[PDB]
Design a protein around this ligand. Structure first.
Ligand code: CA
Ligand code: CA
Ligand code: CA
Ligand code: CA
Lengths: 275, 107, 107, 275
């Protein structure tokens, strides 16, 4: 038996899948720790590693990347869970090492691979507190090239009234995602600031783990791939909407929550975005 | 004679204990670097830099971590240049913890 | 894997600090005895005995000390069998302190 | 110039010295860490060491013993301080090591030397919390042999309402001394219990230190030698009063202070004891 994680439902993905919109022919690059291509509930199309000492994109020594991949596209079968865009082509772009750390340039290089292999959507569930020129150039170039770019907002909760949104999420060209619970309540840990764009389910999110396993994680890391999967669904309905139209759609059709400092525009609703 | 001796502990959790210590090291900078620290010379080197002031150990600039929320409690108890130390801090995950010193948390 | 690491300090005085740390050692029992402790194997041996319970370390029976009143503050911070430890005790002089363990205070 | 520590005066020793009673021809054994025979304000007659690895009684590596010796008999000259019994013959019986620790048997052996060399008064400013058969036998034998035996009560302050008097002070055959300040106030640290006998000055007591020096110490250790010096004065007035008559005298002529649990019989007054 296959279960449907609550997050998939909260954002109205099943409504679209029922009308035949599953993410088909859309290329999503999960920029992260690798994806276990050997997992039963996943189908990884290809990928590459920017991590010098770990050069197999299909070996996830950290487990993070496998969990994120599953929220985007866990297969639609009679086992496991169900991703937002179960037919999306999934690319493993490995930029984080077994301990989860990646150098900026690994990240940047990964985005660069993402651009040149014609990815449609990039998911980056990673962040650091400083920005950089090369980093900004690279995310901005992705957006110019027409890729949808989504990133986790960060996990530094709130702090006075200063922004706690990290990079790359902090950049205007990127969709930055905060996390709510099944109650549409902001997770206490979710970063705040005027740079946050939208919210998604990020509290005990069930997904795939390496070794044919399943589990639940918390983090704006788990909210991101929901938006990334959401973006893939709309491109599967409307293959020649621009990244700009997809973004706009996601942003204008949200369910509003609290003030925008803690909630951006609110919870995405892919059925509504897809019109 | 530098009265210098520290013990660092780490475990999943958000407070002292309701956060069982999962790893624990000792470090000594005086006279020379030793202890059970897979990077004694540097952590020492580290503290020297900042003058044994936990609270002034710049993060990364250069490293990205996963945005999983899986908090880690770090504890430092001891003396530095014969001044008593008892620091505590919760990092949102361990990568965050590690991207913090350079080497103090090189564990 | 025994999460075991301690730091001991001592200085003239009756409280934590308004009692500057004059000597400080580190001890590790797990896996094997080490640290800056002029008697690691025993202090370890010692704690084992009492099961790392400061508060149950019989005095002397056998030793006399001077009856000078010159208090010493002893501090122990760390983990024992992965249980957090933070003990403190003022002994009326240092001889008293020393006649206390057998070896923990073998310093 | 010679100063007179306040403790010497508090107990009325100067009254006796003025009538010619200075402790002359009386043999006092200071059982302790050794005495610096080289100090200018002291005259050590002889002694021996029961400390295996430190065999010179005249070398005080701890300083304690030198300070105690000076409260008993610092010389009466135009330099330093002034002991209670400035002409007493002083014997260094070394039973404590440089760190101040001594084994029970060292102690016992020292008392045994004290008995066989015909000491009149023994001062023991040492203590431990357990008693022993050999220890009791040895102090009791001293008293049978006619020696006055004085000991510091201990420094474990008060504790509920249980006795904090250590050994040998705890034994009935021994005079146990607690410490008062110049105000006849019990020092907070002084041991209590029904075994305490009398009080004496034990708070910042000036005396001799090794290296031709002087300083002040706190402890029931500093009160003891005041009683020991007191005992020597009476024997110098009355050379064939028994230890029993000397004790009795000291005990019956005290200035009463608080309840006897904290003050014994109170502050000794050697002028009054000497009749
Ligand atoms: Ca499935
Ligand atoms: Ca943004
Ligand atoms: Ca003199
Ligand atoms: Ca008694």
């Amino acid at each position: 038996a296959q279960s449907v994680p609550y997050g998939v439902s909260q954002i109205k993905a099943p409504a679209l899948h029922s009308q035949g919109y599953t993410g088909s022919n859309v290329k999503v690059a999960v920029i992260d720790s690798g994806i276990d291509s050997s997992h039963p509930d996943l189908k990884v199309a290809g990928g590459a590693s920017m991590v010098p000492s770990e050069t197999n994109p299909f070996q996830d020594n950290n487990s993070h990347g496998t969990h994120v991949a599953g929220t985007v596209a866990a297969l639609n079968n009679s086992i496991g869970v169900l991703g937002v865009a179960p037919s999306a082509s999934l690319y493993a772009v490995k930029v984080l090492g077994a301990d989860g750390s990646g150098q900026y340039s690994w990240i940047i290089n990964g985005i660069e691979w993402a651009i040149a292999n014609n990815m449609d959507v990039i998911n980056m569930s990673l962040g650091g507190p400083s920005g950089s020129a090369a980093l900004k150039a690279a995310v901005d170039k992705a957006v110019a090239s027409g890729v949808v770019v989504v990133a986790a907002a960060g996990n530094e909760g709130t702090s006075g009234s200063s922004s706690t949104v990290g990079y790359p999420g902090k950049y205007p060209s990127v969709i930055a995602v905060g996390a709510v619970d099944s109650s549409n309540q902001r997770a206490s840990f979710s970063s705040v600031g005027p740079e946050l764009d939208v919210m998604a389910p990020g509290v005990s999110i069930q997904s795939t783990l390496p070794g044919n396993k399943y589990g639940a994680y918390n983090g704006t890391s788990m909210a991101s791939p929901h938006v990334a999967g959401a973006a893939a669904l709309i491109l599967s309905k409307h293959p020649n909407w621009t990244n700009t139209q997809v973004r706009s759609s996601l942003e204008n059709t949200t369910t509003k929550l609290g003030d925008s400092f803690y909630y951006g525009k609110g919870l995405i609703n892919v059925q509504a975005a897809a019109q | 004679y530098a009265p210098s001796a520290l013990v660092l502990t780490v475990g999943k959790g958000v407070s002292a204990t309701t956060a069982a210590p999962e790893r624990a090291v000792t470090l000594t900078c005086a006279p020379g670097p030793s202890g059970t620290h897979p990077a004694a010379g540097s952590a020492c080197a580290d503290l020297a830099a900042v003058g044994g002031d936990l609270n002034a150990l710049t993060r990364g600039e250069d490293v990205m971590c996963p945005k999983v929320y899986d908090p880690v409690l770090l504890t430092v108890d001891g003396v530095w240049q014969g001044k008593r130390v008892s620091y505590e801090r919760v990092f949102s995950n361990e990568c965050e913890m590690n991207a913090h010193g350079s080497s103090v948390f090189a564990f």
